[PDB]
Amino acid sequence: SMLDDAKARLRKYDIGGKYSHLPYNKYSVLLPLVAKEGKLHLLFTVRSEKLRRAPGEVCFPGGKRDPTDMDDAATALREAQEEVGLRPHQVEVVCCLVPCLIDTDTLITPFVGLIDHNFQAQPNPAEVKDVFLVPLAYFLHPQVHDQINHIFEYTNPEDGVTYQIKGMTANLAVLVAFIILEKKPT
Ligand SMILES: O[C@H]1C[C@H](c2ccccc2)[C@H]2C[C@@H]3CNC[C@]31N2
């Protein structure tokens, strides 16, 4: 099936815990895959304007590891719960993608999660101003804008609202799209 196909593809890129013990400042993100109308979508947040770190940007759910987290996956799930109300039984963490190095002293670990069909996001307004879905296929033929430096623009056909997606967030979205959708019969 579509969801089993996705999982089996994603597993071939799983690095596991290989890089998880290194002495970095640690941050995790969740890449939430949602099935809707026969197709895969990714879920994104718009960060609250009132935050000190990264106000108003399009990001995946995530945040800084804390002493309670058993591992880097736990960080990603804790933060998704706090931001959009995603509960543990509503998500299956399928793999850990390549981590991103930043600022010489920081390591960001991405996990891909399959989201239960009865989940409905409850944006927490102290953390997140908006939550929206983008079809995974979009990231193979995106609408690109040069700020000269590449930014994606996505317009939701439901309401005509446009979102800007860039940086690490846009890089990871393209990666997941290639993994899952490259070389498939139609
Ligand atoms: O997901 C975090 C991770 C990064 C970070 C986190 C902490 C310190 C430096 C850099 C930067 C890039 C990402 C884009 N949206 C938000 C975001 N911010």
Side-chain angles (χ1 to χ4, degrees), residues 43 80-87 90 119-125 128 130-131:
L43 182 157
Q81 190 161 359
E82 187 64 37
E83 293 173 37
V84 306
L86 184 74
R87 278 152 77 199
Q90 302 184 114
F119 170 73
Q120 294 211 116
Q122 288 172 295
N124 172 353
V128 131
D130 196 8
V131 176

PDB file of all heavy atoms in Angstrom, residues 43 80-87 90 119-125 128 130-131:
ATOM      1  N   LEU A  43       2.957  18.257   7.300  1.00  0.00           N
ATOM      2  CA  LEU A  43       2.458  19.269   8.215  1.00  0.00           C
ATOM      3  C   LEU A  43       3.580  20.214   8.695  1.00  0.00           C
ATOM      4  O   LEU A  43       4.616  19.747   9.218  1.00  0.00           O
ATOM      5  CB  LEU A  43       1.793  18.562   9.389  1.00  0.00           C
ATOM      6  CG  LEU A  43       1.132  19.463  10.476  1.00  0.00           C
ATOM      7  CD1 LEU A  43       0.065  18.729  11.272  1.00  0.00           C
ATOM      8  CD2 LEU A  43       2.147  20.033  11.439  1.00  0.00           C
ATOM      9  N   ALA A  80       6.084  18.294  19.575  1.00  0.00           N
ATOM     10  CA  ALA A  80       4.884  18.240  18.701  1.00  0.00           C
ATOM     11  C   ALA A  80       3.564  18.263  19.539  1.00  0.00           C
ATOM     12  O   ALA A  80       2.590  18.926  19.164  1.00  0.00           O
ATOM     13  CB  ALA A  80       4.907  17.043  17.784  1.00  0.00           C
ATOM     14  N   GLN A  81       3.583  17.576  20.666  1.00  0.00           N
ATOM     15  CA  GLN A  81       2.430  17.560  21.581  1.00  0.00           C
ATOM     16  C   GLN A  81       2.086  18.966  22.100  1.00  0.00           C
ATOM     17  O   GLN A  81       0.945  19.439  21.939  1.00  0.00           O
ATOM     18  CB  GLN A  81       2.642  16.568  22.721  1.00  0.00           C
ATOM     19  CG  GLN A  81       1.348  16.369  23.535  1.00  0.00           C
ATOM     20  CD  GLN A  81       1.334  15.093  24.378  1.00  0.00           C
ATOM     21  OE1 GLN A  81       2.275  14.289  24.384  1.00  0.00           O
ATOM     22  NE2 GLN A  81       0.245  14.898  25.085  1.00  0.00           N
ATOM     23  N   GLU A  82       3.105  19.644  22.631  1.00  0.00           N
ATOM     24  CA  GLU A  82       2.993  21.008  23.129  1.00  0.00           C
ATOM     25  C   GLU A  82       2.587  22.019  22.071  1.00  0.00           C
ATOM     26  O   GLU A  82       1.798  22.934  22.343  1.00  0.00           O
ATOM     27  CB  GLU A  82       4.330  21.435  23.767  1.00  0.00           C
ATOM     28  CG  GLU A  82       4.277  22.782  24.457  1.00  0.00           C
ATOM     29  CD  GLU A  82       3.324  22.771  25.651  1.00  0.00           C
ATOM     30  OE1 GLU A  82       3.260  21.735  26.362  1.00  0.00           O
ATOM     31  OE2 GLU A  82       2.624  23.782  25.866  1.00  0.00           O
ATOM     32  N   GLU A  83       3.061  21.870  20.837  1.00  0.00           N
ATOM     33  CA  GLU A  83       2.734  22.846  19.828  1.00  0.00           C
ATOM     34  C   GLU A  83       1.405  22.633  19.133  1.00  0.00           C
ATOM     35  O   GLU A  83       0.746  23.608  18.782  1.00  0.00           O
ATOM     36  CB  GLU A  83       3.805  22.910  18.738  1.00  0.00           C
ATOM     37  CG  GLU A  83       5.154  23.449  19.201  1.00  0.00           C
ATOM     38  CD  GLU A  83       6.231  23.326  18.113  1.00  0.00           C
ATOM     39  OE1 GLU A  83       5.955  23.509  16.904  1.00  0.00           O
ATOM     40  OE2 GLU A  83       7.380  23.122  18.474  1.00  0.00           O
ATOM     41  N   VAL A  84       1.073  21.394  18.780  1.00  0.00           N
ATOM     42  CA  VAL A  84      -0.159  21.147  17.973  1.00  0.00           C
ATOM     43  C   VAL A  84      -1.099  20.077  18.536  1.00  0.00           C
ATOM     44  O   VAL A  84      -2.061  19.692  17.854  1.00  0.00           O
ATOM     45  CB  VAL A  84       0.177  20.802  16.512  1.00  0.00           C
ATOM     46  CG1 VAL A  84       1.060  21.884  15.908  1.00  0.00           C
ATOM     47  CG2 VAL A  84       0.861  19.468  16.393  1.00  0.00           C
ATOM     48  N   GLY A  85      -0.805  19.591  19.745  1.00  0.00           N
ATOM     49  CA  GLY A  85      -1.650  18.631  20.454  1.00  0.00           C
ATOM     50  C   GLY A  85      -1.554  17.194  19.999  1.00  0.00           C
ATOM     51  O   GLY A  85      -2.393  16.356  20.398  1.00  0.00           O
ATOM     52  N   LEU A  86      -0.515  16.888  19.199  1.00  0.00           N
ATOM     53  CA  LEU A  86      -0.243  15.529  18.742  1.00  0.00           C
ATOM     54  C   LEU A  86       0.160  14.603  19.874  1.00  0.00           C
ATOM     55  O   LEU A  86       1.170  14.814  20.544  1.00  0.00           O
ATOM     56  CB  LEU A  86       0.823  15.537  17.602  1.00  0.00           C
ATOM     57  CG  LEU A  86       1.145  14.191  16.970  1.00  0.00           C
ATOM     58  CD1 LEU A  86       0.008  13.706  16.039  1.00  0.00           C
ATOM     59  CD2 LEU A  86       2.477  14.257  16.206  1.00  0.00           C
ATOM     60  N   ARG A  87      -0.624  13.551  20.075  1.00  0.00           N
ATOM     61  CA  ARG A  87      -0.427  12.658  21.192  1.00  0.00           C
ATOM     62  C   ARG A  87       0.354  11.439  20.707  1.00  0.00           C
ATOM     63  O   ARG A  87       0.366  11.127  19.505  1.00  0.00           O
ATOM     64  CB  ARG A  87      -1.772  12.282  21.834  1.00  0.00           C
ATOM     65  CG  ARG A  87      -2.286  13.349  22.798  1.00  0.00           C
ATOM     66  CD  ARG A  87      -3.800  13.349  22.901  1.00  0.00           C
ATOM     67  NE  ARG A  87      -4.274  12.245  23.737  1.00  0.00           N
ATOM     68  CZ  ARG A  87      -5.523  11.744  23.742  1.00  0.00           C
ATOM     69  NH1 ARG A  87      -6.484  12.227  22.938  1.00  0.00           N
ATOM     70  NH2 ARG A  87      -5.818  10.727  24.564  1.00  0.00           N
ATOM     71  N   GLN A  90      -0.825   8.779  18.420  1.00  0.00           N
ATOM     72  CA  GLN A  90      -1.246   9.277  17.110  1.00  0.00           C
ATOM     73  C   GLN A  90      -0.102   9.379  16.114  1.00  0.00           C
ATOM     74  O   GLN A  90      -0.303   9.847  14.991  1.00  0.00           O
ATOM     75  CB  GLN A  90      -1.941  10.634  17.274  1.00  0.00           C
ATOM     76  CG  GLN A  90      -3.165  10.592  18.195  1.00  0.00           C
ATOM     77  CD  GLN A  90      -3.888  11.919  18.260  1.00  0.00           C
ATOM     78  OE1 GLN A  90      -5.038  12.062  17.813  1.00  0.00           O
ATOM     79  NE2 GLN A  90      -3.220  12.901  18.780  1.00  0.00           N
ATOM     80  N   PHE A 119      -6.239  12.291  13.667  1.00  0.00           N
ATOM     81  CA  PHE A 119      -5.617  13.489  14.308  1.00  0.00           C
ATOM     82  C   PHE A 119      -6.167  14.742  13.707  1.00  0.00           C
ATOM     83  O   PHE A 119      -6.240  14.854  12.511  1.00  0.00           O
ATOM     84  CB  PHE A 119      -4.062  13.486  14.121  1.00  0.00           C
ATOM     85  CG  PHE A 119      -3.389  14.765  14.536  1.00  0.00           C
ATOM     86  CD1 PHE A 119      -3.253  15.102  15.876  1.00  0.00           C
ATOM     87  CD2 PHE A 119      -2.889  15.632  13.587  1.00  0.00           C
ATOM     88  CE1 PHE A 119      -2.619  16.291  16.259  1.00  0.00           C
ATOM     89  CE2 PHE A 119      -2.249  16.811  13.965  1.00  0.00           C
ATOM     90  CZ  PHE A 119      -2.120  17.140  15.301  1.00  0.00           C
ATOM     91  N   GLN A 120      -6.503  15.714  14.540  1.00  0.00           N
ATOM     92  CA  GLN A 120      -6.776  17.069  14.075  1.00  0.00           C
ATOM     93  C   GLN A 120      -5.959  18.060  14.884  1.00  0.00           C
ATOM     94  O   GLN A 120      -6.095  18.108  16.082  1.00  0.00           O
ATOM     95  CB  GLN A 120      -8.239  17.393  14.306  1.00  0.00           C
ATOM     96  CG  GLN A 120      -9.163  16.542  13.468  1.00  0.00           C
ATOM     97  CD  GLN A 120     -10.410  17.299  13.111  1.00  0.00           C
ATOM     98  OE1 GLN A 120     -10.663  17.571  11.937  1.00  0.00           O
ATOM     99  NE2 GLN A 120     -11.185  17.685  14.134  1.00  0.00           N
ATOM    100  N   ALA A 121      -5.137  18.859  14.227  1.00  0.00           N
ATOM    101  CA  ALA A 121      -4.257  19.816  14.918  1.00  0.00           C
ATOM    102  C   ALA A 121      -5.035  20.825  15.748  1.00  0.00           C
ATOM    103  O   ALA A 121      -6.029  21.386  15.276  1.00  0.00           O
ATOM    104  CB  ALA A 121      -3.432  20.571  13.900  1.00  0.00           C
ATOM    105  N   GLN A 122      -4.552  21.058  16.966  1.00  0.00           N
ATOM    106  CA  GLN A 122      -5.060  22.114  17.858  1.00  0.00           C
ATOM    107  C   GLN A 122      -3.933  23.090  18.126  1.00  0.00           C
ATOM    108  O   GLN A 122      -3.146  22.877  19.064  1.00  0.00           O
ATOM    109  CB  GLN A 122      -5.541  21.471  19.161  1.00  0.00           C
ATOM    110  CG  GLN A 122      -6.836  20.699  18.942  1.00  0.00           C
ATOM    111  CD  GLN A 122      -7.238  19.887  20.156  1.00  0.00           C
ATOM    112  OE1 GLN A 122      -6.546  18.945  20.544  1.00  0.00           O
ATOM    113  NE2 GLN A 122      -8.360  20.261  20.774  1.00  0.00           N
ATOM    114  N   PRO A 123      -3.792  24.121  17.271  1.00  0.00           N
ATOM    115  CA  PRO A 123      -2.663  25.042  17.421  1.00  0.00           C
ATOM    116  C   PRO A 123      -2.628  25.664  18.814  1.00  0.00           C
ATOM    117  O   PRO A 123      -3.653  26.160  19.296  1.00  0.00           O
ATOM    118  CB  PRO A 123      -2.936  26.097  16.361  1.00  0.00           C
ATOM    119  CG  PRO A 123      -3.732  25.407  15.314  1.00  0.00           C
ATOM    120  CD  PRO A 123      -4.559  24.400  16.038  1.00  0.00           C
ATOM    121  N   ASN A 124      -1.480  25.588  19.478  1.00  0.00           N
ATOM    122  CA  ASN A 124      -1.317  26.258  20.751  1.00  0.00           C
ATOM    123  C   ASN A 124      -0.821  27.696  20.480  1.00  0.00           C
ATOM    124  O   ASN A 124       0.335  27.875  20.106  1.00  0.00           O
ATOM    125  CB  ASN A 124      -0.343  25.494  21.600  1.00  0.00           C
ATOM    126  CG  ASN A 124       0.035  26.211  22.879  1.00  0.00           C
ATOM    127  OD1 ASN A 124      -0.331  27.387  23.126  1.00  0.00           O
ATOM    128  ND2 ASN A 124       0.820  25.518  23.685  1.00  0.00           N
ATOM    129  N   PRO A 125      -1.673  28.721  20.709  1.00  0.00           N
ATOM    130  CA  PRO A 125      -1.307  30.101  20.292  1.00  0.00           C
ATOM    131  C   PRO A 125      -0.095  30.761  21.012  1.00  0.00           C
ATOM    132  O   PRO A 125       0.450  31.751  20.514  1.00  0.00           O
ATOM    133  CB  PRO A 125      -2.587  30.896  20.553  1.00  0.00           C
ATOM    134  CG  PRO A 125      -3.219  30.198  21.690  1.00  0.00           C
ATOM    135  CD  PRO A 125      -2.909  28.721  21.509  1.00  0.00           C
ATOM    136  N   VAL A 128       2.505  28.738  18.371  1.00  0.00           N
ATOM    137  CA  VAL A 128       2.299  28.594  16.972  1.00  0.00           C
ATOM    138  C   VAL A 128       1.118  29.481  16.562  1.00  0.00           C
ATOM    139  O   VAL A 128       0.050  29.456  17.192  1.00  0.00           O
ATOM    140  CB  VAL A 128       2.099  27.073  16.771  1.00  0.00           C
ATOM    141  CG1 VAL A 128       0.906  26.728  15.943  1.00  0.00           C
ATOM    142  CG2 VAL A 128       3.406  26.412  16.346  1.00  0.00           C
ATOM    143  N   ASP A 130      -0.092  29.374  13.271  1.00  0.00           N
ATOM    144  CA  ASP A 130      -0.838  28.675  12.211  1.00  0.00           C
ATOM    145  C   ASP A 130      -0.221  27.265  11.999  1.00  0.00           C
ATOM    146  O   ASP A 130       0.917  26.996  12.455  1.00  0.00           O
ATOM    147  CB  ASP A 130      -0.852  29.545  10.926  1.00  0.00           C
ATOM    148  CG  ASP A 130      -1.880  29.117   9.921  1.00  0.00           C
ATOM    149  OD1 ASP A 130      -2.720  28.227  10.238  1.00  0.00           O
ATOM    150  OD2 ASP A 130      -1.838  29.674   8.782  1.00  0.00           O
ATOM    151  N   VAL A 131      -1.023  26.362  11.430  1.00  0.00           N
ATOM    152  CA  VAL A 131      -0.635  24.974  11.077  1.00  0.00           C
ATOM    153  C   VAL A 131      -1.276  24.708   9.723  1.00  0.00           C
ATOM    154  O   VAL A 131      -2.434  25.073   9.512  1.00  0.00           O
ATOM    155  CB  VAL A 131      -1.139  23.959  12.102  1.00  0.00           C
ATOM    156  CG1 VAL A 131      -0.835  22.539  11.688  1.00  0.00           C
ATOM    157  CG2 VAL A 131      -0.524  24.236  13.456  1.00  0.00           C
TER     158      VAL A 131
END
